[PDB]
RNA sequence: CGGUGAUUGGCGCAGCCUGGUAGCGCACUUCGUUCGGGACGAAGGGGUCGGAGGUUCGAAUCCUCUAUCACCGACCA
RNA sequence: CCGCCGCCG
RNA sequence: UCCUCCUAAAGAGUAACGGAGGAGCACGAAGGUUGGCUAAUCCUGGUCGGACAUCAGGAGGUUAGUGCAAUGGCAUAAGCCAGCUUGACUGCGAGCGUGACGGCGCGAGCAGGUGCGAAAGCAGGUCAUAGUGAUCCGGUGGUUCUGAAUGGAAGGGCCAUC
RNA sequence: CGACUUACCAACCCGAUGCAAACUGCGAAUACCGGAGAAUGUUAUCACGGGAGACACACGGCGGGUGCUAACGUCCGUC
């Protein structure tokens, strides 16, 4: 049986997936220091009692419930904590 | 300061009746006079610009600000942030003094003089002329210069049209070719 | 590859040292930064070495 | 063959042909050719149905083409095993949903247009039908 | 540019451009050291070619002859910097200071010329680093020193 | 530290083996049925440097260092050793008589010559295509009989010798070529 | 079928590696030399890199797509 | 030293 | 091997010799902080001056820029400039995120010690994700921590690090 | 130094018409995470400790890559 030659493929490279996204959802009681949202850019901005790490990682700065807002003139999403 | 007091009560009364203004803040006054020197050929030496920047120290009464390049093109072999020109912006007290020295003892010294074109308006009322020598200004000693390249003078006013600003310069007699 | 490493020797009596990278073929002079010392607990100016 | 110029990428996925069409009504011309069967039309099939239709409307008039392929189809060469990458671009198809008007025409009688789309429907793999430009 | 008027505050007399290349063509020995900066390196490298270096006037990134720090070059280099030149043999003669200076400091200046010459261990040295080190005054004294102490 | 198997270096990629470091000029690739592939790599010597011919198989690799070739500027002569000069970083360099052999006559001053830089400092010096030179030891050439082409020998100021035509006798600067070493024209 | 390195002035070849410049040898044009021609001397012209698209301040160079033409050849049954 | 030939009646 | 997007089916994860691109760095300013600023490209007018130098005005709207691919992101600007500087600092770190694990990533705040700002405050690198490899062995510096009878040192240990 | 004539191609806009995994000014159904309550289920939950097996899967429905919208083909998700 005859067998012709076969080409090559330049593609075939992908990364380890970084597990980005929302970790704690809304109305969920968290401890202080818990990561809420891992994200590349600030899809979600930091609201009240929520900080912003160097990785744009929104982390909780107090205990209480995760709250999502649509605040601001630029209609952007903030994340706050009502202190419980 | 001579033709600044001439503007206050002779030129305003000339202009309040020709275009039916209803307030004294409606008349256009000249805001600034900007002197660019687009040297251009400073790609060879830096001291050609320093000779050219010293040429504005005699025409104006202050030091020019050199301008870095905005973009970088291929037709002129320039780069980003290069001193391709130097500018003089003069306003306040000496802008009446430079306009005193221009139209009286610098404009009639232009070689092959016929007059100034009234087509040099952008529709806003900001006149811009172009001079072609350094030897029309009395401060240049005719020996320190080594280039025919001159400069341009932009007279920026606070008008809205060309006819609104043509009668503004008409009181200073502005030779009007 | 190009950017080699240096050793910031403390000019005080201690033997503590920071290390960092400096491109020698661009700015060939030494670094005289001023950081914290965990031994003397002073703010001693550090000097460049190998 | 109606072929695009400097596309975004050379090759794309296969893609399903679900959903209905969007170009339901005839807008420009007086009469149209509405498709009923769910298939696809290669870039030769639009140009072959235009040669057998521009003649029978004798050349004065105006003919529209309401579709454009802009979808590459790959094809492996002769006697090539599976795998080893994606094939080469050969032709361009248009995913024709049911309810899509293919051609339009203005400046012809109804008898001449009826014997024109009949001479172009046989050049197409999909089942088409004759319609009329409805008001509003 | 501005460094032609900012290096004058460091103590240099004749600061400029290719007008100083006419002084090179005349062979003026009023200058001994040449210091430039990497924008007028097209002057010495194209006009002072032969006369600059059996002239031996230096313009190196090997040495610190041409930095872009031309304001703060000659605040100490015009004062106290003595330049190390090569010879065909083993010898590297330098210059000591005025006789009536602090002689305790000069013996540490000779001791801190050891750390400068051992700062480059060219890494292809032979048996010794320093064999004979003698500091003479001008033409009379002979003082044999040691390489270790 | 780099690695280059026989499917990698193809043209203008230096290799290092024992040494001296060589250079690939041109090569072919044969992938024959039953057996291992090879490559008729026509190498080029760099130091002496005439030629070497090897037929590398699929194994093995070779160290690639150094590659660096760049424009220099000759300006200095003293005893034996020579020097050059950069225009992109302005760094000094030292040359030897080993790097100048059968080339030291043509380059005179401020020439745009190139060298090959490898581990301190050169390997060889390549003179430019055209240099201007002057004859000082040349007879006052008569016309003669002469019935044809010729053409008198001229001893050059650098110690070389070229064949010049009749109209240049004493102190006439001329430009020639350095590939073959013949007269082409006179600068005016 | 695959893979790899080329195409640069009429022609043959550089330069690419490591980006700011397009050459060299003939051929060709004019003059001198000869009674004239060839050859030899003097002066000079000639293309802007197969085509297209990227990268970049800037591309003959660095990448990609086809077009064209050579060399490696279609292995175990 | 070098210096080739000069269309066919 | 690592990074961006799609395939991946609206949390995450998800394969193929599936479609596409990049990385094996750079920087002592391009970091920290304070203060100030807002583009691209066309249009008009204007010495040399032209499709494109700089100047003046408007339309226009972030289609610009971000040391470097790609998505996400940013006007309070992370985009640009300047003054002053080294927080690119030591010992920790409640907590969780992600991995079979080795590991990786975020971290309020405390203690000591600085920087800038009048002050509130911010800074344990750079807008973020690529710029990197486990151990063994071996080398340099420090620290009586051990040190084969004792007193030392050698060699080991800890820490910084090649 | 002045250019007029001008069956021919054509940008930015206006109006209409389509297309797209690597387009998004809109946007479900399900799935997913978090709380409360009712009924039900042999704690089906999680944390440890002992001992394994297994890491060649296959077919069909749905959603796809690839292949010729070929295969009882191949590669994933979910049942």
Swiss-Prot record, chain C:
Domain of life per record: Bacteria
> What InterPro entries is this protein classified in?
Ribosomal_bL33 (IPR001705), Ribosomal_bL33_CS (IPR018264), Ribosomal_bL33_sf (IPR038584), Ribosomal_zn-bd (IPR011332)
Query: Which GO CC annotations does the UniProt entry carry?
Result: cytoplasm; cytosol; cytosolic large ribosomal subunit
Q: What is the lineage of its organism?
A: Bacteria, Pseudomonadati, Pseudomonadota, Gammaproteobacteria, Enterobacterales
GO biological process terms, alphabetically, are: cytoplasmic translation; response to antibiotic; ribosomal large subunit assembly
- Among the Pfam families in the record, one is Ribosomal_L33
Any miscellaneous information on file?
Surface exposed on the 50S subunit.
Question: Family, per the entry?
Answer: Belongs to the bacterial ribosomal protein bL33 family.
Gene Ontology MF: a single term = tRNA binding
- Keywords recorded for this protein, A-Z: Methylation, Ribonucleoprotein, Ribosomal protein, RNA-binding, tRNA-binding
Subunit comment: Part of the 50S ribosomal subunit. Cross-links to the P and E site tRNAs.
* Protein name from the UniProt record: Large ribosomal subunit protein bL33
UniProtKB/Swiss-Prot annotation, chain D:
Q: Please report the PTM annotation for this entry.
A: Is hydroxylated on Arg-81 by RoxA. The modification is nearly suppressed when E.coli is grown in anoxia.
UniProt keyword list? Hydroxylation, Methylation, Ribonucleoprotein, Ribosomal protein, RNA-binding, rRNA-binding, tRNA-binding
N-methylmethionine is found on 1
Can you supply a Gene Ontology BP term from the record? cytoplasmic translation
Q: Which Pfam families match?
A: Ribosomal_L16
PROSITE patterns from the entry?
RIBOSOMAL_L16_1, RIBOSOMAL_L16_2
**GO CC list:** cytoplasm; cytosolic large ribosomal subunit
Keyword tRNA-binding present in the record's keywords: the answer is: yes
Modified-residue entries ((3R)-3-hydroxyarginine), positions:
81
Molecular function terms in GO for this entry? rRNA binding; structural constituent of ribosome; tRNA binding
Q: Which NCBIfam families match?
A: rplP_bact
Q: Share what the entry says about its subunit structure, partners included.
A: Part of the 50S ribosomal subunit. Cross-links to the A and P site tRNAs. Interacts with assembly factor DarP(YjgA).
Role noted for this protein: Binds directly to 23S ribosomal RNA and is located at the A site of the peptidyltransferase center. It contacts the A and P site tRNAs. One of the last ribosomal proteins to be assembled in the 50S subunit. The simultaneous presence of uL16 and bL36 probably triggers ObgE's GTPase activity and eventual dissociation from the mature 50S ribosmal subunit. It has an essential role in subunit assembly.
Q: Which HAMAP family does the annotation name?
A: Ribosomal_uL16
Tell me the protein family, please: Belongs to the universal ribosomal protein uL16 family.
Q: Which PANTHER family match?
A: 50S/60S RIBOSOMAL PROTEIN L16, LARGE RIBOSOMAL SUBUNIT PROTEIN UL16M
Q: What is this protein called?
A: Large ribosomal subunit protein uL16
From Swiss-Prot, chain E:
* Keyword Transport tagged: no
Task: Note the SS bond partners.
Answer: none
- Which key words are in the record? Repressor, Ribonucleoprotein, Ribosomal protein, RNA-binding, rRNA-binding, Translation regulation, tRNA-binding
Q: GO molecular function of the protein, one example?
A: structural constituent of ribosome
Gene Ontology annotations of biological process type: cytoplasmic translation; negative regulation of translational initiation; ribosomal large subunit assembly
Quaternary organization:
Part of the 50S ribosomal subunit. Cross-links to the P and E site tRNAs.
The function of this protein is: One of the primary rRNA binding proteins, it binds very close to the 3'-end of the 23S rRNA. Forms part of the L1 stalk. It is often not seen in high-resolution crystal structures, but can be seen in cryo_EM and 3D reconstruction models. These indicate that the distal end of the stalk moves by approximately 20 angstroms. This stalk movement is thought to be coupled to movement of deacylated tRNA into and out of the E site, and thus to participate in tRNA translocation. Contacts the P and E site tRNAs.
Q: Which family does it belong to?
A: Belongs to the universal ribosomal protein uL1 family.
**Name used for this protein in its record:** Large ribosomal subunit protein uL1
Species of provenance:
Escherichia coli (strain K12)
Q: Which gene encodes it?
A: rplA
**What fragment of the full-length protein is this?**
81 to 229 of 234
UniProtKB/Swiss-Prot annotation, chain F:
Q: Which residues carry this modification: N6-(3,6-diaminohexanoyl)-5-hydroxylysine?
A: 34
Q: How is it modified after translation?
A: Is beta-lysylated on the epsilon-amino group of Lys-34 by the combined action of EpmA and EpmB, and then hydroxylated on the C5 position of the same residue by EpmC. Lysylation is critical for the stimulatory effect of EF-P on peptide-bond formation. The lysylation moiety would extend toward the peptidyltransferase center and stabilize the terminal 3-CCA end of the tRNA. The hydroxylation of the C5 position on Lys-34 would allow additional potential stabilizing hydrogen-bond interactions with the P-tRNA.
Q: Name one GO cellular component term.
A: cytoplasm
Q: Which GO terms describe its biological process?
A: negative regulation of translational frameshifting; peptide biosynthetic process; rescue of stalled ribosome; translational elongation
Q: What is the effect of changing residue 33 to K?
A: No lysylation. Loss of in vivo EF-P function for cell growth
SUPFAM superfamilies, per the entry: Nucleic acid-binding proteins, Translation proteins SH3-like domain
Q: Which GO terms describe its molecular function?
A: ribosome binding; translation elongation factor activity
Query: Where found, per UniProt?
Result: Cytoplasm
- Tell me the InterPro entries matching this sequence: Elong-fact-P_C, NA-bd_OB-fold, Rib_uL2_dom2, Transl_elong_fac_P/YeiP, Transl_elong_KOW-like, Transl_elong_P/YeiP_cen, Transl_elong_P/YeiP_CS, Transl_elongation_fac_P
How is loss of this gene reflected in the phenotype of the organism? Disruption of this gene leads to lethality or to a very slow growth phenotype. Required for the expression of poly-Pro-containing proteins.
Name the Pfam families on file: EFP, EFP_N, Elong-fact-P_C
Q: Which domain of life is it from?
A: Bacteria
Keywords, alphabetical = Cytoplasm, Elongation factor, Hydroxylation, Protein biosynthesis
């Amino acid at each position: 049986a005859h067998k012709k030659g076969l080409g090559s493929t330049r593609n075939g490279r992908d990364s380890e997936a970084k597990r980005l996204g929302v970790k704690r959802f809304g109305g969920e009681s968290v401890l202080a220091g818990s990561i809420i949202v891992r994200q590349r850019g600030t899809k979600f901005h930091a609201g009240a009692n929520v900080g912003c790490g160097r990785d744009h990682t929104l982390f909780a700065k107090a205990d209480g419930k995760v709250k999502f807002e649509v605040k601001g003139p630029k209609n952007r999403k903030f994340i706050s904590i009502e202190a419980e | 300061a001579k033709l600044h007091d001439y503007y206050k009560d002779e030129v305003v009364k000339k202009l309040m009746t020709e275009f039916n203004y209803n307030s004294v803040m409606q008349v256009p006054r000249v805001e600034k006079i900007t002197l660019n020197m687009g040297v251009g050929e400073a790609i060879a030496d830096k001291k050609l610009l320093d000779n050219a920047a010293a040429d504005l120290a005699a025409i104006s009464g202050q030091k020019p600000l050199i301008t870095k390049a905005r973009k970088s093109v291929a037709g002129f072999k320039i780069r980003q942030g290069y001193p391709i020109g130097c500018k003089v912006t003069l306003r306040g007290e000496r802008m009446w003094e430079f306009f005193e020295r221009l139209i009286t003892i610098a404009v009639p010294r232009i070689r092959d003089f016929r007059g100034l074109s009234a087509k040099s308006f952008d529709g806003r009322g900001n006149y811009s002329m172009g001079v072609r020598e350094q030897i029309i200004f009395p401060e240049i000693d005719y020996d320190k210069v080594d280039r025919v390249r001159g400069l341009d003078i932009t007279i920026t006013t606070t008008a809205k049209s060309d006819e609104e600003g043509r009668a503004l310069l008409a009181a200073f007699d502005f030779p009007f070719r | 590859g190009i950017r080699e490493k240096i050793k910031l020797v403390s000019s005080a009596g201690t033997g503590h040292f920071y290390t960092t990278t400096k491109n020698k073929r661009t700015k060939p002079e030494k670094l005289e930064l001023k950081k914290f010392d965990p031994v003397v607990r002073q703010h001693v100016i550090y000097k460049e070495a190998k | 063959m109606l072929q695009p110029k400097r596309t975004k990428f050379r090759k794309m996925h296969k893609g399903r042909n679900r959903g209905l069409a969007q170009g339901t009504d005839v807008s420009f011309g007086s009469f149209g050719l509405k498709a009923v069967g769910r298939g696809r039309l290669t870039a030769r099939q639009i140009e072959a149905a235009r040669r057998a239709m521009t003649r029978a409307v004798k050349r004065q008039g105006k003919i529209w083409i309401r579709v454009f392929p802009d979808k590459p189809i790959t094809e492996k060469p002769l006697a090539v095993r599976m795998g080893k990458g994606k094939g080469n671009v050969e032709y361009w198809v248009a995913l024709i949903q049911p309810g899509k008007v293919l051609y339009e025409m203005d400046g012809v009688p109804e008898e001449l247009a009826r014997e024109a789309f009949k001479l172009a429907a046989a050049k197409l793999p999909i089942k088409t039908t004759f319609v009329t430009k409805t008001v509003m | 540019g501005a460094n032609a008027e900012a290096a004058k505050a460091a103590g240099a007399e004749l600061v400029g451009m290719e007008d100083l290349a006419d002084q090179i063509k005349k062979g003026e020995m009023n200058f001994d050291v040449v210091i430039a900066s990497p924008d007028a390196m097209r002057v010495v490298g194209q006009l002072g070619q032969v006369l600059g270096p059996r002239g031996l006037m230096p313009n190196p990134k090997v040495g610190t002859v041409t930095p872009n720090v031309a304001e703060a070059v000659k605040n100490a280099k015009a004062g106290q910097v003595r330049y190390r030149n090569d010879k065909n043999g083993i010898i590297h003669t330098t210059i000591g200071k005025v006789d009536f200076d602090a002689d305790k400091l000069k013996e540490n200046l000779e001791a801190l010329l050891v750390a400068l010459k051992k700062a480059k261990p060219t890494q292809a040295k032979g048996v010794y680093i320093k064999k004979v080190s003698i500091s003479t005054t001008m033409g009379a004294g002979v003082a044999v020193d040691q390489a270790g102490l | 530290m780099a690695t280059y198997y026989s499917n990698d270096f193809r043209a203008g990629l230096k290799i290092m083996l024992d040494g001296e470091p060589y250079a690939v000029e041109a090569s072919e690739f044969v992938k024959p049925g039953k057996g291992q592939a090879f490559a008729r790599v026509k190498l080029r010597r760099l130091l002496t440097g005439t030629r070497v011919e090897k037929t590398f198989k699929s194994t093995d690799s070779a160290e690639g260092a150094d590659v660096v070739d760049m424009n220099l500027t000759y300006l200095y002569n003293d005893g034996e050793f020579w020097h050059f000069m950069n225009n992109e970083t302005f760094e000094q360099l030292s040359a030897d008589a080993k790097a100048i052999g059968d080339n030291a006559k043509w380059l005179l001053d401020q020439a745009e010559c190139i060298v090959t830089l490898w581990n301190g400092q050169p390997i060889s010096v390549t003179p430019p295509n055209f240099v201007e030179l002057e004859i000082v030891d040349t007879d006052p050439g008569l016309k003669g009989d002469t019935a044809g082409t010729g053409g008198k020998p001229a001893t050059l100021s650098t110690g070389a010798v070229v064949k010049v035509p009749l109209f240049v006798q004493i102190g006439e600067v001329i430009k020639v070529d350095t590939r073959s070493g013949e007269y082409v024209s006179r600068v005016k």
